Amino acid sequence: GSPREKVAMEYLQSASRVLTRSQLRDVVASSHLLQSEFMEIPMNFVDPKEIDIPRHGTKNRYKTILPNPLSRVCLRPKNITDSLSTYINANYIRGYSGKEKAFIATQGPMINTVNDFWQMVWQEDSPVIVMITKLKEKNEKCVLYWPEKRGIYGKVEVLVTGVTECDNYTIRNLVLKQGSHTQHVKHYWYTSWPDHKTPDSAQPLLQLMLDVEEDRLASEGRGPVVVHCSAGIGRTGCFIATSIGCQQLKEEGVVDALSIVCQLRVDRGGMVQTSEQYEFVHHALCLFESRLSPETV
């Protein structure tokens, strides 16, 4: 929601700036007009008066960054009544062309939400988790929520079967279990995002992006890809917007980043949280465009 509700939602649902590949290259060259464009996009943060689940604040890492009701991920453990047991700071995110539930954006788990997080990964049959933050960056950003080899979290067991190092991220193959059932999940941990600025190069992110895309292509029938950083909106929003925009560039030869970010704001308030992040998404789109086959006919 926003102070002027209709003005803000009308904007989010109508703003558009379709960029040809040439225009995309020019826009980043002019990293000045992106800032004013960014400032025009409503945050769509959730008015706490809206949501009504007593003490949900205990499970929010950032008190003002909440899951918009319409797309909130509700937990369904088959045996709890704590009410807060059905709550998690996470939202379903629409993908390219509005594809329903392509991703789930969520905050970095807190000690008291680790079980909830796995309950989500389990009930949603999520095939991939993308983590874009260190556990600490000057101050706490996220809690360690997975085991070195094996762990129990509520009624969900997580087994770490393998670990592979890469560019600026590490991949952990995971196996989740509940009784007679198993679920595979690949955990990507991107640790090199700078503490005080956006990545100098978008190459590591696009590599991660491509790896996750191959996972999605082979996981038809499964659930949304889970993405989180600390508050679950900044780096998280950058990763998702970049993924959606690179697909538009590849399939259509153009990209509407403004529309993409607006739709993300609709799904989760604050997605792509700073102007620097907004510029970074465009730089990442530019790097991707630089690798496409030529337009000259």
Please name the defining characteristics of this protein.
monomer, 297 residues, alpha/beta, Protein-Tyrosine Phosphatase, Chain A, 8-stranded mixed beta sheet, 8 helices, 12 strands
Characterise this structure.
Interacts with MAPKs. GO terms for molecular function: protein kinase binding; protein tyrosine phosphatase activity. By secondary structure, this protein is an alpha/beta fold. The protein has one domain (1-297): Protein-Tyrosine Phosphatase, Chain A. Helix content is 33%, strand content 20%. The protein has eight helices and twelve strands. The protein has helices at residues 5-14, 21-29, 33-40, 114-123, 203-217, 234-252, 257-267, 275-290; strands spanning 19-20, 90-93, 103-106, 128-131, 136-137, 139-140, 150-153, 156-165, 169-178, 181-190, 225-228, 254-255. The strands form three sheets. Strands 2-3-11-4-10-9-8-7 form an eight-stranded mixed sheet, sandwiched between helices. A two-stranded antiparallel sheet has the order 1-12. Strand 7 and strand 8 (156-165) form a beta hairpin. The termini are far apart.
